[PDB]
């Protein structure tokens, strides 16, 4: 009976994000001495050079977290994160300039990443 | 990875099946569908999604499917639906309703809704977004009335007047070519859309028609200038030739005819019946029967909306002032008293709820309140839910049917009636980006931000000296869309086809966008969205009892309304 | 606060009434704008209190008497009109001949 | 005939060697030189010197060395000196600084400073006169912010925004050709100089460059749009071609790189680092190290200026609102908290005092106060005198060195950084006559009169109904320079060379004076007047301790400031 | 007086608070703008008194309680923000959830 | 009420004086605009009371003393000027050095 002006009455259930897309869990470490925070929609292979992880496993992917949230790595901190697949045309331009085209070009992306010192290229 | 619904709605606004209370009313709207792809919602800010290479595309130039403005996560309330979408604006118009962002990486992006370098962002998550209100019964009496209207979500003013002259204080009339030209030039400084009505009075065609050619967008027939069979007839002959609308305030006195005589003079032609209940004017006591006819587009003005315990007592002195009447002339008082009837006011509530009265309007400053058209629409809907129950058409416990029926009364239907719905009156692709954001707690009471032609024109915002815009005092203020020459690009002056063809804008130096009035004469009650009912309305001449389908229409006045003392400082 | 244009303007009626009340309290006969301000603010506060329009139309005739105001002020005020938010929304109060 | 110094200063303002207290601070400025000839001082009024045949020449037409306006007996405070002179204005520009009057009879008259029939007089005796403030960090959020700025002596606003849209509430960005055109047209009604920044984001050149060609005067790189290596690089490539400045708010999150990665993307090119201390944004915790580099033009925004006991406590909620962050997202709060550090705020005070941070700015309405750039500059200088002592460079017990260093931060240096110092930013012959008069008791607090292009635009003045203009209430008010079409001639819209060459002003109907942005890419820290220091700034990543030349920079917060509760009603 | 734009605007917060306080004193449950005005003026007068920002962030939660205001008003006010001149210059006070 | 431009503006002097008087009553030393507001409103109410210009030119020097105001405020106020409607029309009151 009490009226909260403008209140919501939400439906039952839950919302599944990024439904139907492959998910991948990887370990990532901040080898730097300042904190690194990573948003939900950055192409994961293009994050800060000083994050150490299997860079190939970030290609064509991003964090599987709610839109507009982030994962925070304090200095020296290692965490497991879950990635989802990029959608749409599966192309990335700009950011760190590692892709500039289809994410399918894994060898080129990794060659650029290695030459520029992004940690974790095999 | 799943998110519960409470947290989802907090972060992105509600989604399918969620309900939202309208202000402090009992009315609940339910999200019918959602254009998003869950996980790819657009949002802007520090570390958020609309960033270069991410939700913002870094490749395309403005002309390549990129927006000037994206409203993210809007809950749209419109005659077309109640639903969740992003809204994309370009060149001052709504170009996309759907899902915005970056096709590079997001699923489900509407192809012409790319967020690019050229794109500004307004966050609509947690807001209700409606079309700007279309007020077709405006007396231009005091320029301070514009901000009053903007603050309650009105974005178009149709009517007439030259300021506080007695003719204008009584009638929505800007008379003759010279007054029309002067007011078209005044309009260059009014931060709202405008159309001007000429005097629908005369017994020869040329004095009436020359107002249309001078730039009027329609005509007003008003009893204070003689709402005679001749003036009715000549005005409609002009309107049929010029493709503009005629509004009527009929002969309350029944001096030259009764209602049936006015209808015979109309002779089946299209007309907009103002304040059809009749307190604001018209054949006493039975004018409201006009709302049953297929050629009548019927509106109410707002002081009778809805029926409350104080409604009757305010009206006599209001009417006497408006119409320049004298307390010491008994027949002036008798005329005023003849217009004020609880029986027809009560029935007017029900006729709105049944879709028999199709439109709301203010009657600003001449028996009406410039900033209460939207407000009183929702108070009426709430009263009718309380007294009549959910409409039979509703489902899942929502009030969506009633919400569509009522929002149409002050958005799309006045636009259709006036011949301007190709430009304004609804949230649809291809229409001008006149949009109102509301916090649900303030819905219908005080607008958050009023967008005009794609730029914010009015906003409730705080201390201009502060570190951020939210500290007190938060008040309604004109924004950059109203400043300098931007007032020209964010507002439309609506004009007749003939005045446009004859070059009136260039002659007068008008810089505002010029809107064409058209498709006014080939419509009827059937074209009023969600409010298309024709029926035989019987009004007893002795008792004023109103019958439809053999049933008396009556309801009680209420002592209290929502959207009232919880909100207002005075 | 979300003040709209009318809320901002009507604050200055309340203020003018407070000014006029302090002038009355120190013994001055009130002038035309002072008398109008007092009666107007009285109406708007009465609406806030939840009185009816009909109550205020009559009470407004008993707020100030002719001995409270300067010569000629009663005859200068033919009526006072004010709109305020009642429990049932905005309504207009007209007080005819408030000071006999 | 001799006059004692106290009486001389009372009558004509101070002369050589006299000192004046700045407001209620401990800062004293000393007159360094005086251009007058004692006995031939100009003054205006009943029975005074500037009368025909006397101090006013009656022979010469306006074009014959006669002024439109003489400011008599000004105490100039400028990067060029602190000194006593008359100031002569003609065609809206400063044409002479020296000694005005009539060569017929006076000694020492500067040849082009004749007071003639055409000359208006402003009495500056007893006033301090400075250049108008140049605020290069303005968010265009609420048009009411213009008068706030004028009242504290600001005459140019550089920044971006479209009103209270979330993009603009976070970032100094007017995005894309259409929003830029709309805001250039809005600017026609803003009584202050303006330049507009486009969105410095993209991975292709054309979406960024088309903003410059549309009329932008520079670019803003902001992390809320993705301050990535790509966006940094493309924006600087555009700026190097177009000869405009780029401002940066860097990647606080260190998401795509640390500070060293941002510097590598900049690659030695010129850039203006906004809020270099970092509370207002940037690589946490070490962004302020950018102020050591030769290619960086570093500014502060004002809420951290100076370090006080309440500074930290206000910042978290301010930041969350500005950047559209959510209290219920832990990483949003962690990001906000990472920006707020007493260690770097305290060091920021000292870096200003050492000439390592070259500029002040507001950040108006997006973590900054539109009317407190000038105010907080002097509060900082006063705090530093109290805590660090007179600077070693001072002499005769004056604070002239510190005064020059600090006045430069909000006048000449922002103008140089933006490429507009050929027009504005200092009291020098050949520059636009944007001048602020201050009573010493109100210096830096409330301007007396603000002159724009040679006409008073804003003034603290009293009752418009009174017999004279001094009776209460004395308040800030717009003057005739803001009215009618005079707003066009008294203000400059600054634009890129390409937009000017492509005829954008004529295309949009802009009537304001058009200023060209130029000479932005061939400057560095060495060009910042009195604030040209380059050094290696070390910021400890763990403790946030700031070191320069092996010394920790720290100071205490203060409980009280001058230029505060003695002056303000709220 | 040399009033600047903010000083002029903020006078109307003080006035709205005085209005609201008189309504509370005569027994009315306060509405949304009344409650905001009272808490806002309280903050700005506290700054004038020389309290700290941190003091006012907490005191602002104890100015009005839910029995002082109409139904739903506590839930309508997520926070109140006000800037005023403290002894150490202008600062922002944010009071979260001022009425439980 | 028929308020003209000056009547509207001068309401805000009365309001600023009321604000300043409440600050003084709770023990604060008054600042520059507060002191000016109090003395100005005093003059305009004195005219309303029917005092002469000459009376107010002298009384205005005895409204506030230096112990009522912050350091330096007496020396910041060289004079206060106000116009108001006296029984014989609008006149100007100039108070020189109102606070010694
Ligand atoms: F009407
Ligand atoms: F910023
Ligand atoms: Ni009518
Ligand atoms: Ni009407
Ligand atoms: Ni920033
Ligand atoms: Ni900023």
Swiss-Prot record, chain A:
GO cellular component terms, semicolon-separated: urease complex
GO biological process, one term: urea catabolic process
Subcellular location: Cytoplasm
Pathway membership, UniProt: Nitrogen metabolism; urea degradation; CO(2) and NH(3) from urea (urease route): step 1/1
EC number: 3.5.1.5
Keywords: Cytoplasm, Hydrolase
UniProt family annotation: Belongs to the urease beta subunit family.
Protein name: Urease subunit beta
Species the sequence originates in: Sporosarcina pasteurii (Bacillus pasteurii)
UniProtKB/Swiss-Prot annotation, chains B, D:
Sites of N6-carboxylysine modification: 220
Post-translational modification: Carboxylation allows a single lysine to coordinate two nickel ions.
List of residues binding Ni(2+) 2: 220, 249, 275
Regulation: Inhibited by fluoride.
Pathway where this protein functions: Nitrogen metabolism; urea degradation; CO(2) and NH(3) from urea (urease route): step 1/1
Cofactor: Ni cation
Compartments it resides in: Cytoplasm
Entry keyword Cytoplasm: yes
Signal peptide positions on this chain: none
Domain Urease: 132-570
UniProt key word rRNA processing: no
InterPro entries: Amidohydro-rel (IPR006680), Metal-dep_hydrolase_composite (IPR011059), Metal_Hydrolase (IPR032466), Urease_alpha_N_dom (IPR011612), Urease_alpha_subunit (IPR050112), Urease_AS (IPR017950), Urease_asu (IPR005848), Urease_asu_c (IPR017951)
First-tier enzyme category under EC: hydrolase
UniProt family annotation: Belongs to the metallo-dependent hydrolases superfamily. Urease alpha subunit family.
Protein name, UniProt field: Urease subunit alpha
Gene responsible for this protein: ureC
């Amino acid at each position: 009976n009490y009226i909260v002006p403008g209140e919501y009455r939400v439906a039952e259930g839950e919302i599944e994000i990024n439904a139907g897309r492959e998910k991948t869990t990887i370990r990532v470490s901040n080898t730097g001495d300042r904190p690194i925070q990573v948003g939900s929609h950055i192409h994961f292979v293009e994050v800060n050079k000083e994050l150490l992880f299997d860079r190939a496993e970030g290609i064509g992917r991003r964090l599987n977290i709610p839109s507009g949230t982030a994962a925070r790595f304090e200095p020296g901190e290692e965490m497991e994160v879950e990635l989802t697949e990029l959608g749409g045309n599966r192309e990335v331009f700009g950011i760190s300039d590692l892709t500039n085209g289809s994410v399918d070009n894994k060898e080129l992306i990794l060659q650029r990443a290695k030459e520029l010192g992004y940690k974790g290229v095999e | 990875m799943k998110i519960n619904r409470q947290q989802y709605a907090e972060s992105y606004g509600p989604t399918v099946g969620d309900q939202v209370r309208l202000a402090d009313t009992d009315l609940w709207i339910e999200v019918e569908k959602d254009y998003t792809t869950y996980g790819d919602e657009a949002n802007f800010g520090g570390g958020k999604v609309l960033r270069e290479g991410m939700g913002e595309n870094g490749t395309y130039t403005r002309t390549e499917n990129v927006l000037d403005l994206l409203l993210t996560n809007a809950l749209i309330l419109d005659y077309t639906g109640i639903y969740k979408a992003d809204i994309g604006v370009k060149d001052g118009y709504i170009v996309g309703i759907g899902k915005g962002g970056n096709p590079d990486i997001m699923d489900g992006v509407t192809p012409n809704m790319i967020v690019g370098t050229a794109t500004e962002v307004i966050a609509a998550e947690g807001k209700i977004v409606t079309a700007g209100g279309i007020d077709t019964h405006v007396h231009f009496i005091n320029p301070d009335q514009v901000d009053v209207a903007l603050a309650n979500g009105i974005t178009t003013l149709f009517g007439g007047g030259t300021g506080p002259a007695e003719g204008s204080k009584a009638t929505t009339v800007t008379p003759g070519p010279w007054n029309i030209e002067k007011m078209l030039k005044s309009t260059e400084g009014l931060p709202i859309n405008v159309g001007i009505l000429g005097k629908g009075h005369g017994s020869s065609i040329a004095p009436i028609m020359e107002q249309i050619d001078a730039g009027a967008a329609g005509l007003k027939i008003h009893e204070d200038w003689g709402a005679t069979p001749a003036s009715i007839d000549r005005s409609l002959t002009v309107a049929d030739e010029a493709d503009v609308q005629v509004a009527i305030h009929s002969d309350t006195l029944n001096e030259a005819g009764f209602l049936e005589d006015t209808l015979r003079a109309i002779n089946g032609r299209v007309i907009h019946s103002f304040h059809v209940e009749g307190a604001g004017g018209g054949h006493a006591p039975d004018i409201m029967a006009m709302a049953g006819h297929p050629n009548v587009l019927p509106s109410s003005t707002n002081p009778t909306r809805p029926f409350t315990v104080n409604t009757i007592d305010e009206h006599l002195d209001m009417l006497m002032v408006c119409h320049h009447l004298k307390q010491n002339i008994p027949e002036d008082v008798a005329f005023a008293d003849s217009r004020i009837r609880p029986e027809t006011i009560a029935a007017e509530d029900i006729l709105h709820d049944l879709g028999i009265i199709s439109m709301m309007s203010t009657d600003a400053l001449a028996m009406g309140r410039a900033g209460e058209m939207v407000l009183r629409t929702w108070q009426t809907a709430d009263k009718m839910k309380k007294q009549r129950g959910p409409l039979a058409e509703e489902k899942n416990g929502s009030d969506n049917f009633r919400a569509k029926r009522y929002v149409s009364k002050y958005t799309i239907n006045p636009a259709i009636a006036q011949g301007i719905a190709h430009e304004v009156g609804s949230i649809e692709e291809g229409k001008f980006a006149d949009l109102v954001l509301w916090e649900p707690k303030f819905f219908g009471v005080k607008a958050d931000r009023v967008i005009k032609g794609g730029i914010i024109a009015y906003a409730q915002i705080g201390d201009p000296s502060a570190s951020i815009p939210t500290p007190q005092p938060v008040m309604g203020r004109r924004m950059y869309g109203t400043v300098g020459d931007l007032i020209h690009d964010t507002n439309i002056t609506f004009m007749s086809k003939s005045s446009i063809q004859q070059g009136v804008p260039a002659k007068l130096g008008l810089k505002r966008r010029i809107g064409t009035v058209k498709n006014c004469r080939n419509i009827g009650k059937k074209d009023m969205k969600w409010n298309d009912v024709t029926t035989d309305i019987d009004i007893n001449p002795e008792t004023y009892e109103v019958k439809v389908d053999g049933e008396v229409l009556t309801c009680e006045p209420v002592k209290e309304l929502p959207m009232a003392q919880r909100y207002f400082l005075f | 606060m979300h003040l709209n244009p009318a809320e901002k303007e009507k604050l200055q009626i309340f203020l003018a009434s407070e000014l006029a009340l302090k002038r009355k309290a120190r013994g001055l006969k009130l002038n035309y704008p002072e008398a109008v301000a007092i009666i107007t603010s009285f109406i708007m506060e009465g609406a806030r209190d939840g009185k009816t329009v009909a109550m205020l139309m009559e009470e407004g005739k008993h707020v100030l008497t002719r001995d409270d105001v300067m010569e000629g002020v009663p005859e200068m005020i033919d009526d006072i009109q004010a709109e305020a938010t009642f429990p049932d929304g905005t309504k207009l109060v007209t007080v005819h001949n408030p000071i006999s």
